Design a protein around this motif. Structure first.
Motif, short mmCIF file in Angstrom:
data_model
loop_
_atom_site.label_atom_id
_atom_site.label_comp_id
_atom_site.label_asym_id
_atom_site.label_seq_id
_atom_site.Cartn_x
_atom_site.Cartn_y
_atom_site.Cartn_z
N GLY A 295 -22.93 2.74 -7.14
CA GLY A 295 -22.79 2.29 -5.71
C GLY A 295 -21.10 1.91 -4.57
N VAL A 296 -20.64 1.81 -5.79
CA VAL A 296 -18.80 1.71 -5.84
C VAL A 296 -17.80 1.45 -6.34
N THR A 297 -17.15 1.50 -6.39
CA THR A 297 -15.77 1.45 -7.34
C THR A 297 -14.60 0.56 -6.81
N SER A 298 -13.96 -0.46 -7.60
CA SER A 298 -13.28 -1.54 -7.74
C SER A 298 -12.12 -0.86 -7.49
N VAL A 299 -11.11 -1.08 -7.28
CA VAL A 299 -9.81 -0.26 -7.37
C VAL A 299 -8.25 -1.30 -7.05
N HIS A 300 -7.51 -1.54 -8.76
CA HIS A 300 -5.93 -2.51 -8.25
C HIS A 300 -5.23 -0.99 -7.93
N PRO A 301 -4.19 -1.16 -6.69
CA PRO A 301 -2.91 -0.06 -6.65
C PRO A 301 -2.38 -0.75 -7.36
N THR A 302 -1.10 -0.37 -7.51
CA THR A 302 -0.19 -0.73 -9.05
C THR A 302 0.66 -0.77 -8.12
N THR A 303 1.19 -0.73 -7.14
CA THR A 303 2.36 -0.25 -6.05
C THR A 303 2.29 -0.38 -4.82
N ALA A 304 0.87 -1.01 -4.36
CA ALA A 304 0.80 -1.13 -3.30
C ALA A 304 0.09 -2.72 -2.84
N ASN A 305 -0.24 -3.14 -1.55
CA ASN A 305 -1.09 -4.45 -1.52
C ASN A 305 -2.51 -3.99 -0.83
N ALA A 306 -3.45 -4.11 -1.77
CA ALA A 306 -4.59 -3.15 -1.29
C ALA A 306 -4.72 -3.03 0.31
N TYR A 307 -4.88 -4.47 0.89
CA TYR A 307 -5.64 -4.96 2.22
C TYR A 307 -4.50 -3.83 3.13
N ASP A 308 -3.11 -3.52 2.53
CA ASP A 308 -2.33 -2.54 3.19
C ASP A 308 -2.60 -1.29 3.50
N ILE A 309 -3.29 -0.28 2.71
CA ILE A 309 -3.62 0.27 2.72
C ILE A 309 -5.52 0.49 3.51
N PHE A 310 -5.88 -0.37 3.47
CA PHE A 310 -7.10 -0.12 4.22
C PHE A 310 -6.45 -0.74 5.45
N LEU A 311 -6.06 -1.24 6.07
CA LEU A 311 -5.45 -0.99 7.20
C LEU A 311 -4.78 0.17 7.75
N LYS A 312 -3.98 1.36 7.03
CA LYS A 312 -3.43 2.18 7.40
C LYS A 312 -4.16 3.60 7.47
N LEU A 313 -5.28 3.68 6.28
CA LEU A 313 -6.41 3.89 6.17
C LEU A 313 -6.62 5.01 8.11
N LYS A 314 -6.78 3.47 7.88
CA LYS A 314 -8.30 3.10 9.14
C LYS A 314 -7.61 3.43 10.36
N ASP A 315 -6.28 3.14 11.01
CA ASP A 315 -4.83 3.05 11.78
C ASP A 315 -4.69 4.79 11.71
N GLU A 316 -3.97 5.40 10.82
CA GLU A 316 -4.37 6.76 11.00
C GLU A 316 -4.69 7.84 9.91
N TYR A 317 -5.96 7.64 9.75
CA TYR A 317 -6.24 8.57 9.17
C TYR A 317 -7.44 8.73 9.35
N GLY A 318 -7.70 8.05 9.86
CA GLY A 318 -9.12 8.29 10.23
C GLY A 318 -10.83 7.90 9.42
N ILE A 319 -9.94 6.70 8.47
CA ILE A 319 -11.24 5.88 6.82
C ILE A 319 -11.19 4.61 6.84
N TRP A 320 -12.46 4.49 7.08
CA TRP A 320 -12.80 2.75 6.62
C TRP A 320 -12.58 2.86 5.01
N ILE A 321 -12.67 2.35 3.95
CA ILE A 321 -12.39 1.79 3.38
C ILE A 321 -12.78 0.39 3.11
N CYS A 322 -13.33 -0.29 1.70
CA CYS A 322 -13.45 -1.68 2.26
C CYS A 322 -13.00 -2.62 1.48
N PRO A 323 -12.35 -3.12 1.91
CA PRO A 323 -11.42 -4.00 1.71
C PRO A 323 -12.27 -5.64 1.53
#
Lengths: 362, 362
Positions: A295-323
């Motif tokens: 149902g779901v895959t958990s990911v650790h970004p090794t170069t970036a803050n996970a919540y930052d990636i959530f916010l950028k995808l939401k606001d600039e790419y039309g995508i919600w991932i799960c923070p």
């Protein structure tokens, strides 16, 4: 509008089919009728079928989120004389611990470091210790860890333990056979693999579960599962339920049947997950779960803050991932594989990750 | 289909506008976002405005039917040291009695024969008796009896009583001014005058209500109103809420504003009720309520069984009226005046009554 045009890779609410959505635009019918009763009896039959519940099982539909059904189950199935083993690998296992504390159910928390599998050797450390019940979240959604219900069920049977399964994220995503694993209770929610709007949850009770509820002396009105069971005998609920959501659920259960039943939906989601995981091999992402769930895959970004990636995808790419929250906010995000997604949607998401990489965000 | 083409004169679910329905067909958005927070803060502001809540009031949105919010309020606002006066003229007043019993809140039930008004002289029989709180259902929907909140509020203020109002059927149908009447708590539901799908309820707390909740020591997770308040500070909820219904509520609150606010909706429903009552003067129907409410009219058929009339209208005339239960099943039915109904709909219903008369059913 903010809720229009978005790709949703969360684990709830998720994307719904056009037929379920169409039902959502219908007038909501009056419900104290033989017609609505029929819909409710059908909903129960499908739930028992898809759960692979043993003969004599019962389901009830609760007008509340899954947490409310978790609470109802704890309140109606355990007492101060019980001793409950709670599998706690993350947020939802911890929520069961919190419910045991609130309701004064004696318990032991079996802690697992986030992402870690439960081995048979670990579980059997608790063998022969007078436990009377066990609470598990079959997919610990916060970490995307799947637990082995056949293994846990065998342990419970050996120890005569009442076996409660939260399958809010596991039901219809991962194999689960209530009869075979010996689960006494299964809980699920409308907004997860069922992909309907949030606001309903479902409790399935094996005959032992029914018996346990019938013997409860709970001080609650809304969460009185005896009352819920008595009303569902005629396809009704004690109070006004989320009628519209229950009609959407009916459609969805028929859609599942049309496409091959529970096993076919599990297989589709398994493929959705595998497709995503194959496509991120060259990105700076580490998979966190030692026991993957479809149902779901958990990911650790090794170069970036996970919540930052959530916010950028939401606001600039039309995508919600799960923070994530708490101690996992900066280090883990999740990508859902449930609801009305396709393999091409995975390509769109990975393309967005690649563009973030070009921008030097990751 | 059974939920298509029907005229709905019940008191919930009721008929919704095309704009609310359209929102119901949208994909449900992910909700742990600043965008959804904004919607929730706006929802709260409108609720406080329409309730005429005093400065400093707060609202919370609960993912459960109104009964769940009634229970939450009882659990979070009263203790074993309280003494609560409960107005009991019917099913919903009785439900508050049942909640006091379940939760061990000492109480006195002020019984009123079904349909009977509460006079000032009757209420003041309970003056100076060390009561600490009062529970009332402002429209006792089972009998369509409206209570005078200015009169009750004055009594409560004189006696320093914590004043709880269930306005599930009264809010936006009958005049209600939280600030003026001194209500500490107002409860309402999504599927009544708001005319959205069932599955949300709302609790509005005056500053004294907020204070009372903040001091509670309740053993509950789902109904912990402290947690609900803390989360709503940022426009969020503790668990997954009925996001889709909350977006529909937002639209509806804006629709109310567009058409003149709370007073305009009260006036429209008052006219809907008056229109119905004018049109049944020559039929074998007696009005039951001694204190009419705009939202609903209770009727005693003098020639026929009330439930028979419900069934015939449902199965042969494309109409749901609201049946009664218990001791009122055979003798009372109700006709709602809420949701997206017109005066012409009243004509359609009366024409159906006239046709039943021609058939000799009534």
């Amino acid at each position: 509008l903010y809720f229009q045009g978005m790709l949703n890779f969360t684990v709830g609410p998720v994307m719904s089919s056009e037929e379920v959505r169409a039902i959502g635009a219908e007038q909501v019918p009056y419900f104290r009728t033989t017609e609505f009763s029929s819909t409710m009896l059908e909903n129960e039959k499908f739930m028992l079928e898809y759960a692979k519940a043993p003969e004599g099982s019962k389901a009830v539909f609760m007008t509340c989120s899954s947490t409310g059904s978790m609470e109802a189950v704890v309140m109606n199935c355990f007492t101060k004389k019980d001793k409950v083993l709670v599998i706690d690998g993350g947020s939802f296992g911890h929520r069961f611990v919190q419910l045991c504390e609130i309701h004064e159910i004696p318990y032991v928390a079996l802690k697992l470091e986030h992402g870690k599998k439960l081995t048979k050797e670990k579980l059997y450390e608790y063998d022969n210790q007078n436990f009377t019940g066990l609470l598990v979240n079959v997919d610990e959604t916060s970490t995307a860890v799947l637990y082995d219900t056949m293994m846990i069920g065998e342990f419970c049977k050996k120890n005569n333990m009442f076996f409660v399964c939260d399958c809010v994220s596991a039901f219809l995503a991962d194999p689960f056979n209530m009869n075979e694993c010996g689960a006494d209770v299964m809980i699920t929610g409308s907004q997860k693999v069922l992909a309907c709007p949030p606001g309903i949850s479902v409790i399935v009770l094996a005959p032992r579960g029914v018996e346990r509820v019938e013997k409860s002396k709970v001080r609650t009105m809304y969460f009185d599962l005896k009352d819920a069971l008595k009303n569902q005998e005629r396809g009704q609920t004690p109070f006004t339920p989320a009628v519209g959501i229950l009609l959407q659920i009916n459609e969805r259960l028929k859609e599942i049947k049309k496409h091959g039943g529970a096993d076919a939906e599990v297989a589709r989601i398994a493929s959705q997950a595998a497709d995503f995981r194959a496509k991120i091999k060259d990105l700076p992402f580490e998979l966190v779960s030692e026991s993957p769930a479809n149902g779901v895959t958990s990911v650790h970004p090794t170069t970036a803050n996970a919540y930052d990636i959530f916010l950028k995808l939401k606001d600039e790419y039309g995508i919600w991932i799960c923070p994530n929250g708490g101690e996992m906010k900066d280090t883990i995000f999740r990508v859902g594989h449930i609801g009305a997604l396709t393999h091409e949607d995975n390509t769109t998401l990975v393309n967005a990750f690649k563009d973030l990489q070009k921008r030097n965000l990751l």
